[PDB]
């Protein structure tokens, strides 16, 4: 059997970066040269393991967890990187073993007047913890009132959402983000 | 009742440390975005600094590694410690909370600083 | 980073006949641009975020609007109290930055 990486990358409508899908990868043979010649991602790096020895490694699961970002914090998907969206929606570990795949959806995640589906935690009360996921939708609390679920001033929806066009800037444009992580079961 | 009053600044020596302050009234400094803005008299007015919700640290290009945003909580306190200071920081810095990093929503009365001999 | 243009960098105009103040931009900023109104001896308040939202106690005289590069600040009824010096800056790129601002005048 193969590991089902192809509804991971070529899902139809994947998640928010605030919530960010995981799937769990596991008793499969995995090939990742096909995801590493494949060419279509203008982001592959990978930290701990090189990409064309980690096909002949073996790990007991991987996790697989995918999100869209806009194009300019693709550079945030790191080990000990500081910003809204890896500090509120999506941190790593600075012991990251594992790596991060981003390609452009300008094609398909941007339409004409906005796809503003896709939204980022902007307001939270302390960093995130590595692998952890908020969704939670109560009033975020900028000032000293019961704000009581309603908002106003000082007391603001936390979640940001993006605006996507096809006619805005590259570094503007939806990037679709697939991260992987590793821990034996998972071999190639 | 929403005040920013901003205090620290003054003459101080060229090559000197400032330790300025904006003391907050009816939201939290720790928990909101906070900036700091500088507006020198002949250049535009410029963006100096910002702190995130507990967050993180980011600076300008021209004020990078010598100057450094540093809050307080125990009281809503924003500081701005200030070193190694040069003459084109001749500046009235104001303090300011932001919507987001996106826009100074609200802005304080602002602190002048002289850097000279 | 990008720089921005007030081009009428001083406009002097009658009590009451609808300024236009403009501001150009480098690079593209969506809809991401903000006014701030700075008049004599205080801090700049806060006219227009996202280049067409007034925020908070701003009436609906000032009109701000645009998009991409090319950004509008529309004032419409010109008291007195509007003479001041009108900035813009962008949000889209770290760091942000503002414009040269345009010193605004009302004539008796």
């Known amino acids: 059997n193969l590991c089902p990486f192809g509804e991971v990358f070529n899902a139809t409508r994947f998640a928010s970066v605030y919530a960010w899908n995981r799937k769990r990868i596991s008793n499969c043979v995995a090939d990742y040269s096909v995801l590493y010649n494949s060419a279509s991602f203008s982001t592959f790096k990978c930290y701990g393991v090189s990409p064309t020895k980690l096909n002949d490694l073996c790990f007991t699961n991987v996790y697989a967890d995918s999100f869209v970002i806009r194009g300019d914090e693709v550079r945030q998907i790191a080990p000990g990187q500081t910003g809204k969206i890896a500090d509120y929606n999506y941190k790593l570990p600075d012991d990251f073993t594992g790596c991060v795949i981003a390609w452009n959806s300008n094609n398909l995640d941007s339409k004409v007047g906005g796809n503003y589906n896709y939204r980022y935690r902007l307001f939270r009360k302390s960093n995130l913890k590595p692998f952890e996921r908020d969704i939670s939708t109560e009033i975020y609390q900028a000032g000293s009132k019961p704000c009581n679920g309603v908002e106003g001033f000082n007391c603001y929806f936390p979640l940001q959402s993006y605006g996507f066009q096809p006619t805005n800037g590259v570094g503007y444009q939806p990037y679709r983000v697939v991260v992987l992580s590793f821990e034996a079961t998972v071999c190639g | 009742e929403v005040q920013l009053v901003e205090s620290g600044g003054g003459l101080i020596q060229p090559g000197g440390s400032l330790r300025l302050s904006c003391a907050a009234s009816?939201?939290?400094?720790?928990?909101?975005?906070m900036s700091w803005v500088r507006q020198a008299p002949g250049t535009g007015l410029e963006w100096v600094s910002v702190?995130?919700?507990?967050?993180?640290?980011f600076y300008a290009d021209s004020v990078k590694g010598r100057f450094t945003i540093s809050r307080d909580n125990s009281k809503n306190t924003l500081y701005l410690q200030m070193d190694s200071l040069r003459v084109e920081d001749t500046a009235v810095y104001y303090c300011?909370?932001?919507?987001?990093?996106?826009?100074?929503?609200?802005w304080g009365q602002g602190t002048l600083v002289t850097v000279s001999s | 980073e990008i720089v921005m243009t007030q081009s009428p960098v001083s406009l002097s105009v009658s009590p009451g006949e609808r300024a236009t103040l403009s501001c150009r931009a480098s690079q593209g900023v969506a809809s991401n641009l903000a006014w701030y109104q700075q008049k004599a001896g205080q801090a700049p308040r806060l006219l227009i975020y996202?280049?067409?939202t007034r925020a908070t106690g701003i009436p609906a005289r000032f009109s701000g609007s645009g998009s991409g590069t090319e950004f509008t600040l529309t004032i419409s009824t010109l008291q007195s109290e509007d003479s001041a010096v009108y900035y813009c800056?962008?949000?889209?790129?770290?760091?942000?930055?503002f414009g040269q601002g345009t010193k605004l005048e009302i004539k008796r």
């Open positions: 300011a909370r932001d919507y987001g990093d996106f826009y100074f929503d609200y």
């Open positions: 800056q962008q949000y889209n790129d770290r760091p942000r930055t």
């Open positions: 996202g280049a067409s």
């Open positions: 702190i995130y919700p507990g967050g993180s640290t």
């Open positions: 009816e939201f939290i400094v720790s928990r909101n975005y």
